[PDB]
Design a protein around this nucleic acid. Sequence first.
RNA 1: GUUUAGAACGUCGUGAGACAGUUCGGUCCCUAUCUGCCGUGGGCGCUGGAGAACUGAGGGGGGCUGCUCCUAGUACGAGA
Length: 141
Amino acid sequence: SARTTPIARYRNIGISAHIDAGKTTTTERILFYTGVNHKIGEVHDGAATMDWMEQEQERGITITSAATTAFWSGMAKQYEPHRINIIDTPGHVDFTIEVERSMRVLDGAVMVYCAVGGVQPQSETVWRQANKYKVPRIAFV
RNA sequence: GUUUAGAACGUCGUGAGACAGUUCGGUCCCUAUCUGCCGUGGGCGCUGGAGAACUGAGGGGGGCUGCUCCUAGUACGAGA
Ligand SMILES: Nc1nc2c(ncn2[C@@H]2O[C@H](COP(=O)(O)OP(=O)(O)OP(=O)(O)O)[C@@H](O)[C@H]2O)c(=O)[nH]1
Ligand SMILES: [Mg+2]
Ligand SMILES: [Mg+2]
Ligand SMILES: [Mg+2]
Ligand SMILES: [Mg+2]
Ligand SMILES: [Mg+2]
Ligand SMILES: [Mg+2]
């Protein structure tokens, strides 16, 4: 019953953005690259793993906050396998509670942004929710 | 179906009968002369006669559209 991964190698990251900014797409790609999934499933095809719930495969949105983990070592494997507990949160204003609950406990965040339209009405809302809890965040255009 | 002759009901009439009342049953002919049209030939013409290949003035035919997929979850839209 020893420590499998050192606690310094943990990353409690999570995704928050405006609707259709590409949160679920990034997580799907992560899982695939890290080896958790064996295929890439698109969200508008209903085949993304993070949108597990029906009315999420049908409508094409994310409603709940689903938490998974993965092991990433770097491109050229520059470090030991770090464990990332990535969390995909919905970007809609109808589910702001699903961001705040997930950003209560996240150690790090990353604010993904659409390149053609950068800062959208819900981009500012998840930014204020993140700085409420003083979360250190990155940005992925 | 309606629009003959048979019969019956309801109704009307003393009655024969009658009802845009309703019921059952009840003969639909024509070998195409002309025009028209569809085809298919004969004659003559086109200026010596003939065999072929053509040009195109003109005429006719034809012209319908669904559903998916890509563009693209792109434009628009806070979102949907
Ligand atoms: N051209 C292009 N389309 C992308 C890209 N990333 C995502 N999309 C499309 O945008 C939609 C994905 O947006 P999502 O990330 O699934 O929605 P979300 O950001 O996870 O957040 P919620 O809607 O609240 O659940 C799909 O149609 C994607 O194919 C990209 O990098 N380039
Ligand atoms: Mg858009
Ligand atoms: Mg959508
Ligand atoms: Mg999503
Ligand atoms: Mg005549
Ligand atoms: Mg013509
Ligand atoms: Mg599409």
